[model samples]
Target: SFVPSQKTYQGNYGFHLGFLQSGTAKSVMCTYSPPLNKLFCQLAKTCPVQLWVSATPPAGSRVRAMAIYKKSQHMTEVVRRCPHHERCSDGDGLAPPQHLIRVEGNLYPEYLEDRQTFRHSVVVPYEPPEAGSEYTTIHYKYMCNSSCMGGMNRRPILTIITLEDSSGNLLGRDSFEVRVCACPGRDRRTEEENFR
Candidate 1:
C-alpha cells in the first residue's frame, strides 16, 4: 500500500504533496515525488507553483542511504536545539570531529569550483547561532517584499551547515529549507473548522 506522508498547503499560494512507502515498519520512510508538474503549469502564471517530488529508496539503503540520512537528521536536530537561557547553540559536541563548524550561505567552494554542479545559493536572513547559554532569544525576520526576485516568484532558501575538524576533515554536512511567502500564519479556529 501507498499513502500520502506529508501535505503542506498555503491556500492558493503553494502546496507540497509528499508520498510515503508502505510495507515493513522499518522501511516505512517517505520519498519525494512530483506527479503534478505539468498539471499546474497554468497555476505558475498566477502564483509561482512547483511540484516537488522524489523516488523511493533502492537496495543497499540500510548501509548507505541510512548513513547519510542519519547524519543529516542528527545535524538538523542539533542545529535546532537550544538549551535554557540560550538563544543559540554551538555545534561543538553536537557536530562530529569535535572541531569548528562552518556555516555557508552557498554550496561549499569545493563543490562550486568544479563548475559541474548547477546549484545556486539563497540569501538567508538569520545565521544559526553558536552554542551559548547567555542569550535569551533569537531574533529573525524575513521581508516578503524584497526576499523574492521580481516580487513575483519567491524561492525557498536553503542553508548549508558543514562540520569539519582541524586539517579540514569533513565530518558531516546538512541543509535546511525554508519557504517564506505572503501567506497568513496558522489559525487554530480555521484549522478546527476545516477538520469539522
Candidate 2:
C-alpha cells in the first residue's frame, strides 16, 4: 500500500516526514525544524518509516543481511514515555509481534524467530520486493503508549541498521532516531519521560 504520501524525502516530492505539502521540512516548539542534520521523526506518526539500504553494499561487494543495534556510536537508545501512565511497556514484547514475516531469505537461506528484539542475518520483509531493484527498504513501525498523550516531554529513540561488505570484512551503519510526542519530535533504552 505504498502511496504518494508515503514518500519520506523531498526528492520523492516530500519532506518534513510529517507535513510535506510544498516540500515543507519541519517545526519547532510545535512547528519549526533544523535542516541537513541527523534524522528525527515524530513518534506514532513516524511508524512505517523506511530505511534505504542497498541490498549489496557495492556493485561487486558480496551481499549480506542487516541487523538492528541496541547501542552504537550514533544511537541514543531511549524508550517512549507517556504523560500520565508510568507503567507502559511499549518496547516490551516477544517474537517481533505478529508482523515480521518469514522470507525465502533476501539473499541468505531462511529466517528463524526467537526472543524479543531478536537478531537475524536477513532483511525479511512483510512481503517480497522486486528482485530487479538494488535498494532494499525496511519498513519500521514503533509501538507507542498513548501516541497522542498530552504534555511536552519527549526523547530520542534510535535503531541502528548494520551491513557488512568487502567479503564480510568491512561494514557500514545507518541509525534512525525517533522522537515520540504530540509535539511531533521522538523510543527504547530508558523510560520516556521528557514532557514530565
Model 1 lDDT tens row, 31-132: 111221111111001211112212212222110000001222222221211122122343223222211112223232221111332222111121222365
Q: What's model 2's lDDT at 178? A: 37
* Residue pairs in collision within model 1: 32-53, 32-54, 33-53, 33-54, 34-53, 89-130, 89-131, 90-130, 90-131
In terms of lDDT, the best-performing candidate is 2
| TM-score top scorer | 2
- TM-score to true structure, per model: 0.23, 0.36
For model 2, how does the per-residue alpha-carbon lDDT over 1-196 read when each residue is reduced to its tens digit? 1111111222221112221222223342112122322233343333332334433234333222322222343122223233333344342233232222222213332333324433333333222224774334343333333344332233333343344334443344444443434333322112233223
Give the lDDT of residue 19 in candidate 1: 22
